Amino acid sequence: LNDGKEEPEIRRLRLEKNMIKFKGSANGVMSRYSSLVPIEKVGFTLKNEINSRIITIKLKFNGNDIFGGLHELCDKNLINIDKVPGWLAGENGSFSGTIMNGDFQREQ
Amino acid sequence: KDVLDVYIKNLENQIGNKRYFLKQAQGAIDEITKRSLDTEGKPVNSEVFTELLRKPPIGFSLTSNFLSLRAQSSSEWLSLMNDQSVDQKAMLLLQNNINSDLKELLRK
Amino acid sequence: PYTWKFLGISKQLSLENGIAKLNQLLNLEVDLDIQTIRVPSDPDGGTAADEYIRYEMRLDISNLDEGTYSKFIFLGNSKMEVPMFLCYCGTDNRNEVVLQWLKAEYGVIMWPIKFEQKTMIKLADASIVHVTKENIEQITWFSSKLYFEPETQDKNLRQFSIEIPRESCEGLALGYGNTMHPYNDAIVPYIYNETGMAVERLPLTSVILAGHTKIMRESIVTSTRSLRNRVLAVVLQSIQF
Amino acid sequence: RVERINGLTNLQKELVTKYDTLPLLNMNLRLSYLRDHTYPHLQVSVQSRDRVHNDGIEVLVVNYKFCRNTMNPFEIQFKMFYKFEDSTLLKWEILRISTNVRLKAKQLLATRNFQKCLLSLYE
Amino acid sequence: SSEKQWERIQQLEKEHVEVYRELLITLDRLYLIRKHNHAVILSHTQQRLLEIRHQLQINLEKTALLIRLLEKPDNTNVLFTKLQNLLEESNSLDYELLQSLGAQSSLHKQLIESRAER
Amino acid sequence: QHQMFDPGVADLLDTDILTSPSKRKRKLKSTSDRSELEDYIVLENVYRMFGITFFPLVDPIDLKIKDASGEIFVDREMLGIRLEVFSERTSQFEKPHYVLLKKRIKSNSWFLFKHTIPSFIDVQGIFDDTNGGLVISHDDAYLFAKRVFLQLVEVQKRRQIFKDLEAKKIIHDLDLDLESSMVSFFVKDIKVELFVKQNEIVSCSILDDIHDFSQNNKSKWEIALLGSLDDLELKLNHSFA
């Protein structure tokens, strides 16, 4: 959040880090953003407990490839890779659901 | 690749040599400036400076970067330069039109 | 339903001096209110330079709709480098007529206004807050809905939203503790922590407080007929450089 | 920073650099998962290992010891030859068996498919 | 191909000369402070003469290896073949800069006489 | 030695790394490691020679810091299993299979997160059955792993024998389902449909019509084709005509 003064190699491996976090392989097993199975819509619902109070956040995404777009935003450095959870990265693909206790649960 | 491989290895070894030289050099600077326990400075004698003025792949690096930096910086100068000429000339012809127009207003 | 549009004013015109020539220009007489307000009364916001002067001017031949009800607001302050801005609502073209009079009369030059994402968040924080008769601040919670619209290759991600009901907003604000600007203070850091997403950096398009207002790129839409003072103060502070 | 890793890499830096999901290649870790997390009490050692580079064939003789019953562990020794390329086995031979299990295991070892023999001896 | 390593050197040579120059800058006044324990106050003109000497050292060293490579233009070192183009460009580019630098003065004089007229 | 440094400069500056590269190569960085990895992995081969093979694994997102020592740790343990079957048909191993397990946050018990096992092997049901579903011990994990491994071997064992029958021209062309449970083949001109459990044929059907293939002949053929798979090759060769 704090913040061209940069060199090639470390940037290359940063892009590789984003690649694997969104694709699972350094070579990027299937453009650099198109995913294996593109997803058009997903709806998530986080449920977390804070001070014995339950809090709901419901994210809704739309497009031709949600996770490819998020990958592009990561490349443009609008999103921090290390704080992207797996369910947001694309695992449990095609399943909208609720996440409780760090475990994905498909919507009924 | 071998000729470039061997040359990168020799120049990396020489770079490491120069890193150790700089590190031990600055260590000597620190220790002999600690011998300069006072914040003041000794007037660097002309005779001492005179005898420093009597005693003293590296060049390929020196040739390569003096020449390459002579390459793009020149093209940047003329390009930024010529870019200034074309549009300031455009101002000048617009300038002369207004002067020429206003010149007849003066006669009017 | 009550939309708004804001313009900047390059000189601290005394509108009362010139009301009559407007009236004959518009073929009607407009009201002109005067209020010296102290909007940022909280201690960290300040206790000086709060003395904004507010003007309410209206073109109400009638008040059956926004166009007839269309009311102008001028708010200015002498310490402000650009001293004053303007607000109006509705589709009525008499607004254009009065703007033309202003620019031709006072020799003043005017331009429209835009908002940044942080400006939008601050404005949304300013929208919820209310002050009691005892000069005490209070907050009314609404189900916030952040709504973004990014640009991505091949339209991979066209739009996405983050909806936050009243209970979640209140819980986040209380967890952060007693505070005055919850959206900036608590909610956005929580979103970033849970998703790594920087709401400030992301291409925000609208902030909707359900049943209360919609904050947008070029305009404000309001449930109430009028804008509370902190909204206008935030706008003015955003005009500057 | 950037690092080069291999089968000998310290697991800590493999983990710190872990942003993929592939198997951990830490080699003693795989060997331990095999040796004392799916085959505990199986004390095995390779006795000879020379490869005939001219023929390009590895030659192995590997000795096992099954020590669930430490009062009388039984042992066995496999000689074994594989192509060292294209991943193909040529032959394997049981050079040695402890007499305490010779008959009771011979019918199993008479069968091919070594996997069967070894893990069945274990169980 | 070999271009990867060639560019690795195209950056490592910038590093090499940067560091060689700061190494000279440490060496010279390390010797001076060796002569007197606290000779840290070398003057602006003294520093400038030292800088001039170091620039002359650039002259001598790059001349030295230019001699090494061109005195027997044998093209055995693939790097020398690239240094040929790298030398060609440096002196091919010069004429355009000289001419434009000359011409802009006349253009600005046209601007000045127009302003005086105005 | 040439003047790498001036003799008045080399008097102070250390020359040791130029006399020997060991002092410099000490920082930059062996033969034993490359040669001992040799025997350890050869033993690792010898351990993959068993088929059921635990292998390690981890999930990136589950890594955090302890906030006082500046040290990293993993929140949730993860176990990997590799499933190799010796293909006697080729004297090589088939492309392996993998199944991966994670620990619950509160319960301190495993749960099945990711796996490569095909859906016709209900790995989730096997896991829930093991120890009543409270899979904790590595012995319980190996029980689960052995169950899935035997279930895979029960597929490769059918595929190997059927491909062996095809290879020796005991049967004409054939088609297989993914798990090799339903199989169709022409023997010479007669064709047969089979449905097999692990190691055993449970139902049979003969489709072609031939002069000598009366219903009684058909019935006794179809009945004789049932039983263990090991005897199928023998009895089919005997019933060649």
XYZ file of N, CA and C in Angstrom, chain C residues 14-121:
324
model
N -19.929 38.919 -5.073
C -21.017 39.197 -4.140
C -22.312 39.115 -4.938
N -22.984 37.964 -4.857
C -24.132 37.718 -5.723
C -25.269 38.689 -5.434
N -25.435 39.083 -4.167
C -26.502 40.014 -3.814
C -26.395 41.318 -4.595
N -25.177 41.730 -4.946
C -24.958 42.911 -5.779
C -25.030 42.465 -7.233
N -26.235 42.524 -7.794
C -26.491 42.046 -9.140
C -27.737 41.188 -9.236
N -28.432 41.007 -8.110
C -29.641 40.191 -8.099
C -30.699 40.791 -9.018
N -30.813 42.120 -9.040
C -31.885 42.763 -9.796
C -31.710 42.568 -11.300
N -30.477 42.704 -11.795
C -30.255 42.552 -13.232
C -30.430 41.100 -13.671
N -30.067 40.140 -12.820
C -30.527 38.769 -13.030
C -32.037 38.653 -13.060
N -32.726 39.315 -12.138
C -34.166 39.134 -12.062
C -34.831 39.595 -13.348
N -34.437 40.769 -13.837
C -34.986 41.243 -15.103
C -34.494 40.395 -16.271
N -33.284 39.831 -16.176
C -32.813 38.944 -17.236
C -33.626 37.655 -17.266
N -33.940 37.101 -16.094
C -34.725 35.874 -15.991
C -36.229 36.118 -15.993
N -36.675 37.374 -16.011
C -38.093 37.725 -15.991
C -38.787 37.261 -14.712
N -38.038 37.107 -13.623
C -38.605 36.706 -12.341
C -37.636 37.120 -11.247
N -38.121 37.118 -10.008
C -37.302 37.459 -8.852
C -36.943 36.191 -8.087
N -35.646 36.006 -7.827
C -35.138 34.825 -7.140
C -34.811 35.192 -5.701
N -35.006 34.233 -4.804
C -34.615 34.413 -3.416
C -33.099 34.311 -3.274
N -32.595 34.817 -2.151
C -31.171 34.724 -1.843
C -31.021 34.649 -0.332
N -30.614 33.487 0.161
C -30.358 33.267 1.575
C -28.877 33.474 1.871
N -28.574 33.735 3.140
C -27.206 33.953 3.597
C -26.998 33.167 4.883
N -25.979 32.309 4.895
C -25.628 31.516 6.066
C -24.117 31.492 6.225
N -23.643 31.847 7.416
C -22.242 31.690 7.792
C -22.147 30.459 8.685
N -21.543 29.397 8.162
C -21.560 28.088 8.800
C -20.151 27.728 9.248
N -20.077 26.732 10.128
C -18.855 26.288 10.798
C -18.707 24.777 10.658
N -18.787 24.296 9.412
C -19.093 22.881 9.175
C -18.069 21.938 9.800
N -16.758 22.075 9.551
C -15.808 21.117 10.146
C -15.500 21.452 11.604
N -16.488 21.221 12.470
C -16.371 21.591 13.875
C -15.601 20.569 14.702
N -15.353 19.376 14.167
C -14.596 18.384 14.911
C -13.166 18.884 15.129
N -12.507 18.456 16.213
C -11.221 19.086 16.561
C -10.119 18.807 15.556
N -10.026 17.577 15.048
C -9.015 17.267 14.045
C -9.322 17.908 12.699
N -10.594 18.190 12.410
C -10.926 18.911 11.196
C -10.575 20.381 11.264
N -10.659 20.975 12.448
C -10.255 22.348 12.671
C -11.314 23.141 13.411
N -10.877 24.296 13.915
C -11.761 25.282 14.516
C -11.634 26.653 13.866
N -10.752 26.808 12.879
C -10.600 28.046 12.131
C -10.635 27.715 10.647
N -10.912 28.735 9.838
C -11.200 28.600 8.413
C -12.483 27.819 8.156
N -13.315 27.634 9.182
C -14.600 26.971 9.044
C -15.696 27.904 8.555
N -15.409 29.199 8.427
C -16.443 30.219 8.255
C -16.848 30.339 6.786
N -17.376 29.240 6.256
C -17.918 29.255 4.908
C -19.224 30.035 4.878
N -19.446 30.759 3.785
C -20.647 31.564 3.590
C -21.462 30.916 2.481
N -22.703 30.558 2.796
C -23.556 29.772 1.918
C -24.691 30.636 1.388
N -25.009 30.455 0.108
C -26.079 31.186 -0.560
C -27.049 30.181 -1.157
N -28.336 30.348 -0.867
C -29.386 29.566 -1.505
C -30.152 30.452 -2.479
N -30.102 30.102 -3.764
C -30.848 30.811 -4.792
C -31.692 29.796 -5.543
N -32.929 30.177 -5.854
C -33.902 29.269 -6.442
C -34.619 29.942 -7.603
N -34.936 29.141 -8.622
C -35.677 29.583 -9.797
C -37.122 29.097 -9.774
N -37.732 29.037 -8.594
C -39.025 28.373 -8.429
C -40.153 29.302 -8.858
N -40.507 29.225 -10.142
C -41.852 29.620 -10.549
C -42.864 28.697 -9.887
N -42.511 27.419 -9.769
C -43.241 26.453 -8.965
C -42.223 25.478 -8.385
N -42.718 24.485 -7.643
C -41.873 23.456 -7.047
C -42.453 22.067 -7.288
N -43.102 21.869 -8.437
C -43.723 20.587 -8.743
C -42.715 19.526 -9.171
N -41.542 19.926 -9.658
C -40.513 18.978 -10.062
C -39.145 19.609 -9.849
N -38.102 18.808 -10.086
C -36.734 19.271 -9.862
C -36.408 20.477 -10.734
N -36.829 20.454 -11.999
C -36.522 21.564 -12.887
C -37.103 22.876 -12.397
N -38.379 22.863 -12.009
C -38.975 24.053 -11.411
C -38.400 24.312 -10.025
N -38.219 23.256 -9.230
C -37.617 23.383 -7.907
C -36.133 23.729 -7.969
N -35.511 23.647 -9.150
C -34.066 23.762 -9.316
C -33.498 24.944 -8.549
N -32.671 24.641 -7.550
C -32.120 25.633 -6.640
C -30.605 25.627 -6.744
N -30.025 26.815 -6.841
C -28.583 26.972 -6.895
C -28.017 27.118 -5.491
N -26.764 26.701 -5.328
C -26.034 26.884 -4.081
C -24.649 27.422 -4.406
N -24.331 28.591 -3.859
C -22.982 29.134 -3.860
C -22.428 29.069 -2.446
N -21.220 28.533 -2.314
C -20.532 28.487 -1.033
C -19.082 28.874 -1.259
N -18.611 29.868 -0.501
C -17.281 30.403 -0.696
C -16.640 30.796 0.619
N -15.385 31.224 0.511
C -14.578 31.589 1.672
C -13.385 32.375 1.152
N -13.068 33.491 1.811
C -12.081 34.418 1.266
C -10.667 33.854 1.326
N -10.381 32.993 2.302
C -9.058 32.393 2.425
C -8.775 31.343 1.360
N -9.742 31.034 0.500
C -9.626 29.913 -0.417
C -9.089 30.439 -1.746
N -8.049 29.787 -2.280
C -7.321 30.361 -3.413
C -8.242 30.592 -4.605
N -8.971 29.563 -5.023
C -10.190 29.739 -5.806
C -11.349 29.835 -4.816
N -12.084 30.950 -4.779
C -12.821 31.283 -3.556
C -14.178 30.617 -3.420
N -14.776 30.194 -4.531
C -16.177 29.807 -4.511
C -16.449 28.828 -5.643
N -17.458 27.984 -5.431
C -17.966 27.061 -6.436
C -19.483 27.200 -6.491
N -20.114 26.360 -7.309
C -21.535 26.474 -7.606
C -22.137 25.082 -7.680
N -23.418 24.974 -7.331
C -24.174 23.738 -7.465
C -25.560 24.049 -8.004
N -26.105 23.116 -8.778
C -27.476 23.236 -9.255
C -27.993 21.848 -9.597
N -29.310 21.763 -9.777
C -29.987 20.499 -10.019
C -31.036 20.678 -11.105
N -31.433 19.555 -11.696
C -32.507 19.530 -12.665
C -32.035 19.751 -14.090
N -32.964 19.527 -15.019
C -32.711 19.681 -16.446
C -33.099 21.053 -16.982
N -33.590 21.954 -16.132
C -34.057 23.251 -16.605
C -32.908 24.045 -17.214
N -33.165 24.652 -18.374
C -32.136 25.402 -19.083
C -31.976 26.827 -18.574
N -32.866 27.299 -17.695
C -32.656 28.600 -17.067
C -31.367 28.616 -16.257
N -30.927 27.443 -15.794
C -29.618 27.324 -15.163
C -28.525 27.829 -16.097
N -28.586 27.423 -17.366
C -27.617 27.903 -18.345
C -27.688 29.418 -18.482
N -28.899 29.973 -18.440
C -29.075 31.413 -18.589
C -28.385 32.152 -17.444
N -28.606 31.696 -16.209
C -27.982 32.363 -15.066
C -26.466 32.190 -15.095
N -25.977 31.025 -15.528
C -24.531 30.846 -15.643
C -23.939 31.823 -16.652
N -24.619 31.995 -17.790
C -24.178 32.967 -18.780
C -24.135 34.366 -18.184
N -25.154 34.726 -17.400
C -25.167 36.050 -16.785
C -23.970 36.218 -15.866
N -23.708 35.210 -15.029
C -22.590 35.269 -14.093
C -21.283 35.542 -14.821
N -21.002 34.724 -15.837
C -19.721 34.836 -16.527
C -19.611 36.151 -17.289
N -20.716 36.630 -17.866
C -20.667 37.891 -18.598
C -20.647 39.101 -17.671
N -21.197 38.968 -16.465
C -21.355 40.108 -15.570
C -20.096 40.334 -14.752
N -19.689 39.330 -13.980
C -18.583 39.508 -13.051
C -17.229 39.273 -13.697
N -17.185 39.080 -15.014
C -15.928 38.770 -15.664
C -15.299 37.496 -15.162
N -16.101 36.591 -14.625
C -15.612 35.394 -13.955
C -15.643 34.234 -14.937
N -14.678 33.332 -14.789
C -14.529 32.170 -15.655
C -14.788 30.919 -14.830
N -15.514 29.980 -15.432
C -16.100 28.859 -14.713
C -15.855 27.569 -15.481
N -15.821 26.460 -14.741
C -15.515 25.155 -15.303
C -16.231 24.082 -14.497
N -16.477 22.909 -15.081
C -17.093 21.817 -14.317
C -16.079 21.130 -13.414
N -16.595 20.233 -12.572
C -15.827 19.616 -11.499
C -15.899 18.100 -11.627
N -14.837 17.435 -11.171
C -14.741 15.983 -11.138
C -14.378 15.547 -9.725
N -14.433 14.235 -9.493
C -14.123 13.647 -8.197
C -13.129 12.508 -8.360
N -12.246 12.368 -7.377
C -11.353 11.226 -7.281
C -12.007 10.124 -6.449
N -11.387 8.943 -6.467
C -11.906 7.829 -5.682
C -11.857 8.144 -4.191
N -10.731 8.687 -3.727
C -10.631 9.086 -2.327
C -11.602 10.216 -2.016
N -11.790 11.135 -2.965
C -12.810 12.164 -2.805
C -14.183 11.534 -2.631
N -14.474 10.501 -3.419
C -15.758 9.819 -3.319
C -15.934 9.166 -1.956
N -14.888 8.506 -1.458
C -14.986 7.839 -0.162
C -15.187 8.863 0.947
